Design a protein around this nucleic acid. Structure first.
Lengths: 312, 312
DNA sequence: TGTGGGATTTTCCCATG
DNA sequence: CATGGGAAAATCCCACA
């Protein structure tokens, strides 16, 4: 049967969430394959069907129970924190460019969440899967705008209370839901929703892109701990490591680590450490190893930097 | 006649103002000569008079024209932002301990200022000197003998509008005013106020504690060129200098400066620079000079750190 | 349980084509 | 203006003694 597939995920790290106060037009959510001279965007495709379809995109939480998120989608073809796009008759690929992730404040979560949930139930935006189980009957909206009963409003209030610390404002996910044309012509046949990879706010220090701005000594000796000053982007002192790796011909990689205490991390932006061994010098010619920053929690690495090892 | 003397000024730098949200008991404003062992506080003394008196402490601005400040005084013997203590009848020296400088937010400056002005007019806490000249007749006349009139209120409102646009929230000053009895019982005879030195918010970037945490090089050639990585507390890229200096036997002070661009200041917490040339490019005995950070708008310097120029 | 200090959130603003 | 990015303003929280 018909199903929805994500052709290109969004980039998990690097994108910055914007609060309302920061204004609009700060850049769209890049796709996973996007580089500086190849602006790519998230892309989905509907398979086993060539015809008209309606695709909606919602921001969902990153917890075990995938629920709605208080952050909003903004940009072209966005309304009330949700994106809606026409999957054309012939071309079944759909890209999402110029999308922004509006970062709600901790205070204004509840209200926002409530509204979103309400709109979902009022528009059939997967009220059963995301808002609450017993609301699954509100998916068949019929035409467009409906009316809600007080019992339905109090279930929404209940899940609006659910918004406890299980709401993580530093990570969201894209959920894409397709809709096939009904016998009446309306776009109501719901396909299976597909969740994308988790997008992390680059302003979160636990999930920012690690980067070595510049290093003190570009080379060193295998003799022992030679002190090096490394200027980097924002890292957390208790979650950061400096890894020297060496790619080998057998497929394996040699690992060494710089020696430093969390106190040696100066105000999250610089590290003073000591270089490790190699081990020893067999080939008296210098060796071209690499060095990078590695986050201990998620094993995320920075772009490599060419380091050199000297003998006696 | 009798007058007021500042025995010990408040500490100019290093004290952190606190917002309402940060709660109290974060530390008291120390005097200039305070250290770890043996604490010290601002101290005033009434001279050419022995007996009962009352001393008030107000927060004033550091501009050309002295005005009331929107920041408040909190702590021992504080109310409505003003500190009120008694002096005497034997000891004419009063110290002020457990004082805190409450940092108003920018949103609540105007209203706060207005209120302060009003109070200063009603209690006679120097309205002519601090609020507006024509309000000089509102001298301390009685606990209720003053209800402000409409023209006075409009003068206060216009002064608050104009002074909100000028107020620097990173610096305040203490103004001490002494009041002596009036052959009646109340303390109305106003001794001339005395203004203290400026007090800078150590959390503000333009007044933060200048400190060199560490350097990757402490020695250098007397010829200028060596690159040094310097890890420092928060500085501003366009307002910071690295100053080498040496005190001479004739009392002269030679100075050179590290060469760097604002882009060489890394996230306010690191500076990569090139070392300057020494006094004489021809020397034999190594020369121990000092190196310090200096703020361009301040001449305020960090602690001197040794640096050995080598005769090459 | 007070005292500092660091780090996080929110907001503001600049550089650049 | 459209984008990025750095930094200031306001808030929260933790270590330590």
């Amino acid at each position: 049967g018909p199903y929805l597939q994500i052709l290109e995920q969004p980039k998990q790290r690097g994108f910055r969430f914007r609060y309302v106060c920061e204004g609009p037009s700060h850049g769209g959510l890049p796709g996973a394959s996007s580089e500086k001279n190849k602006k790519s965007y998230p892309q989905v495709k509907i398979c086993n069907y060539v015809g008209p379809a309606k695709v909606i995109v919602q921001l969902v939480t990153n917890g075990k129970n995938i629920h709605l998120h208080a952050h909003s989608l903004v940009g072209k073809h966005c309304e009330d924190g949700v994106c809606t796009v026409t999957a054309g008759p012939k071309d079944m690929v759909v890209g999402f460019a110029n999308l922004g992730i509006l970062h709600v404040t901790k205070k204004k979560v509840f209200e926002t969440l409530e509204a979103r949930m309400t709109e979902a139930c009022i528009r059939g935006y997967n009220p059963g899967l995301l808002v609450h189980s017993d609301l699954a009957y509100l998916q068949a909206e019929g035409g467009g705008d409906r009316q809600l009963t007080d019992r339905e409003k109090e279930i929404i209030r209940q899940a609006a209370v659910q918004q406890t610390k299980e709401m993580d404002l530093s990570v969201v996910r894209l959920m894409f839901t397709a809709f096939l044309p009904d016998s009446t012509g309306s776009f109501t046949r719901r396909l299976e929703p597909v969740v994308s990879d988790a997008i992390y706010d680059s302003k979160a220090p636990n999930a920012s892109n690690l980067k070595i701005v510049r290093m003190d000594r570009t080379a060193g000796c295998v003799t022992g701990g030679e002190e090096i000053y490394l200027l980097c982007d924002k890292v957390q002192k208790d979650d950061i490591q400096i890894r020297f790796y060496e790619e080998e011909e057998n497929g394996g990689v040699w690992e060494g680590f710089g020696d430093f205490s969390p106190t040696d991390v100066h105000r999250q932006f610089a590290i003073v450490f000591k270089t490790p061994k190699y081990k020893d010098v067999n080939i008296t010619k210098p060796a071209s190893v690499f060095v990078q920053l590695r986050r201990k929690s998620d094993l995320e690495t920075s772009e490599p930097k060419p380091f050199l090892y000297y003998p006696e």
